Design an enzyme around this catalytic site. Structure first.
Site, PDB file in Angstrom:
ATOM      1  N   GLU A 127       8.930  19.878  -1.554  1.00  0.00           N
ATOM      2  CA  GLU A 127       8.211  21.151  -1.311  1.00  0.00           C
ATOM      3  C   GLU A 127       6.722  20.862  -1.135  1.00  0.00           C
ATOM      4  O   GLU A 127       6.205  19.882  -1.745  1.00  0.00           O
ATOM      5  CB  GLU A 127       8.481  22.132  -2.456  1.00  0.00           C
TER       6      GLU A 127
ATOM      7  N   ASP B 163      10.248  10.864  12.995  1.00  0.00           N
ATOM      8  CA  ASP B 163      10.417  12.333  13.162  1.00  0.00           C
ATOM      9  C   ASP B 163       9.180  12.931  13.816  1.00  0.00           C
ATOM     10  O   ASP B 163       8.757  14.044  13.411  1.00  0.00           O
ATOM     11  CB  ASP B 163      10.738  13.047  11.840  1.00  0.00           C
TER      12      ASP B 163
ATOM     13  N   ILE C  41       4.017  26.578   0.893  1.00  0.00           N
ATOM     14  CA  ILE C  41       3.798  26.694   2.375  1.00  0.00           C
ATOM     15  C   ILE C  41       4.922  25.985   3.140  1.00  0.00           C
ATOM     16  O   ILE C  41       5.031  26.233   4.339  1.00  0.00           O
ATOM     17  CB  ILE C  41       2.412  26.173   2.821  1.00  0.00           C
ATOM     18  N   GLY C  42       5.720  25.141   2.480  1.00  0.00           N
ATOM     19  CA  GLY C  42       6.789  24.360   3.142  1.00  0.00           C
ATOM     20  C   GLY C  42       7.873  23.955   2.169  1.00  0.00           C
ATOM     21  O   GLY C  42       7.565  23.784   0.977  1.00  0.00           O
ATOM     22  N   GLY C  43       9.110  23.858   2.656  1.00  0.00           N
ATOM     23  CA  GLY C  43      10.317  23.608   1.841  1.00  0.00           C
ATOM     24  C   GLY C  43      11.385  22.844   2.620  1.00  0.00           C
ATOM     25  O   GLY C  43      11.263  22.741   3.855  1.00  0.00           O
TER      26      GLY C  43
HETATM   27 CL1  9IV Z   1       7.978  23.676   8.095  1.00  0.00          CL
HETATM   28  C1  9IV Z   1       7.181  24.508   9.393  1.00  0.00           C
HETATM   29  C2  9IV Z   1       7.864  24.745  10.577  1.00  0.00           C
HETATM   30  C3  9IV Z   1       7.193  25.313  11.647  1.00  0.00           C
HETATM   31  C4  9IV Z   1       5.854  25.632  11.540  1.00  0.00           C
HETATM   32  C5  9IV Z   1       5.174  25.424  10.349  1.00  0.00           C
HETATM   33  C6  9IV Z   1       5.844  24.874   9.260  1.00  0.00           C
HETATM   34  O1  9IV Z   1       5.265  24.820   7.999  1.00  0.00           O
HETATM   35  C7  9IV Z   1       4.678  23.639   7.517  1.00  0.00           C
HETATM   36  C8  9IV Z   1       3.999  23.724   6.312  1.00  0.00           C
HETATM   37  C9  9IV Z   1       3.294  22.632   5.837  1.00  0.00           C
HETATM   38  C10 9IV Z   1       3.252  21.452   6.568  1.00  0.00           C
HETATM   39  N1  9IV Z   1       2.391  20.424   6.136  1.00  0.00           N
HETATM   40  C11 9IV Z   1       1.045  20.473   5.906  1.00  0.00           C
HETATM   41  N2  9IV Z   1       0.361  21.576   6.275  1.00  0.00           N
HETATM   42  C12 9IV Z   1      -0.960  21.573   6.046  1.00  0.00           C
HETATM   43  N3  9IV Z   1      -1.714  20.614   5.493  1.00  0.00           N
HETATM   44  C13 9IV Z   1      -1.011  19.529   5.143  1.00  0.00           C
HETATM   45  N4  9IV Z   1      -1.533  18.353   4.687  1.00  0.00           N
HETATM   46  C14 9IV Z   1      -0.506  17.433   4.603  1.00  0.00           C
HETATM   47  C15 9IV Z   1       0.672  18.007   4.971  1.00  0.00           C
HETATM   48  C16 9IV Z   1       0.378  19.364   5.299  1.00  0.00           C
HETATM   49  C17 9IV Z   1       3.973  21.359   7.761  1.00  0.00           C
HETATM   50  C18 9IV Z   1       4.689  22.447   8.230  1.00  0.00           C
END
Ligand code: 9IV
Length: 292
Positions: free
Chosen positions: A27, A134, A20-22
């Protein structure tokens, strides 16, 4: 190139569903918890990656347990390939929620009530001796449960730094600290590569809430750090408040007066938001903009 493949299983418990994120620091995966049967957030970094952040994140996340606006800690671990931390999964990110809005603006009702919660979470991480460094919309998300869907969570601590020693004395500031956070919401102190203090997190909050209520900042389409810094250093910040509640002049004046050593007046800033809502009949039980 992902650290964990889909359906990879960690400590015989957390099954990877998808990334879900990188980004260069590690990650984030959604995983299923095979014991409790809920889905969770799984953060991993390469065991080899020269900069080891997760140990920071876990230490900050554990110090904050029992506080509202923080993910529940589930687990952490090392091994040959990666380190990992398992925490409560949260829902829609404030960056996505802002972008989904017709005008890329929130109502003042949504803006001020998000302000109160984010300010609580900033006071929280400061109270256990850490700067976030941040503060930005993508680092906050609303809950995904009947019990949390109106609660806003601070998601990530990957850039945090302890500003205390053991006793609660403020660390000496380095003569130069290379700013590492997001250009848009960085204080003038951060742009000048100065040691960040608690006030610099509250600067980032200020810029974030203006962007929420107004839909843009003046330095919006500038990605050059140094350009953005030169614009902010000169910009008459009262202008930012043209279409904000007047109580925000108290917020601005307060944080403009702080230095690295000084503990902010968090109740002053909390009062700005509450007085702003009260003047305007904004109730704590109002729909957020993305509901109805
Ligand atoms: Cl990187 C980004 C840019 C813009 C909009 C969304 C984005 O995606 C994420 C994906 C995951 C996270 N973090 C989390 N998400 C959901 N539950 C979580 N528990 C702890 C952390 C975490 C943050 C942004």
């Amino acid at each position: 190139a992902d650290i964990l493949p889909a359906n990879y299983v960690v400590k015989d418990r957390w099954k990877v569903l998808k990334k879900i994120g990188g980004g260069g620091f590690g990650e984030i995966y959604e995983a299923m918890d095979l014991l409790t049967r809920e889905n969770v957030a799984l953060k991993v970094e390469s065991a080899q990656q020269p900069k080891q952040v997760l140990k920071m994140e876990v230490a900050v996340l554990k110090k904050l347990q029992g506080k509202d606006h923080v993910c529940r800690f589930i687990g952490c671990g090392r091994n040959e390939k990666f380190n990992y931390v398992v925490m409560q999964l949260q829902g829609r990110n404030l960056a996505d929620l802002r972008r989904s809005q017709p005008r890329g603006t929130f109502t003042l009702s949504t803006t001020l009530r998000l302000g109160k919660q984010i300010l609580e979470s900033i006071e929280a991480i400061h109270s256990v001796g850490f700067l976030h460094r941040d503060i930005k919309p993508s680092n906050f998300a609303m809950g995904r449960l009947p019990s949390t869907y109106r609660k806003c969570y601070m998601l990530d601590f990957g850039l945090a730094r302890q500003y205390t020693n053991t006793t609660g004395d403020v660390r000496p500031p380095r003569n130069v600290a290379g700013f590492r956070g997001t250009v848009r919401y960085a204080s003038v102190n951060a742009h000048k590569n100065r040691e960040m203090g608690r006030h610099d997190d509250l600067w980032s909050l200020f810029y974030m809430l203006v962007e929420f209520a107004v839909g843009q900042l003046p330095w919006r389409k500038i990605k050059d750090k140094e350009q953005v810094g030169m614009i902010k250093e000169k910009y008459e910040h009262r202008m930012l408040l043209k279409h904000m509640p007047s109580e925000f002049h108290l917020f601005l004046d307060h944080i403009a007066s702080l230095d690295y050593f000084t503990k902010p007046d968090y109740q002053l800033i909390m009062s700005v938001f509450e007085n702003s809502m009260k003047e305007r009949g904004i109730a704590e039980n109002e729909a957020f903009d993305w509901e109805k």
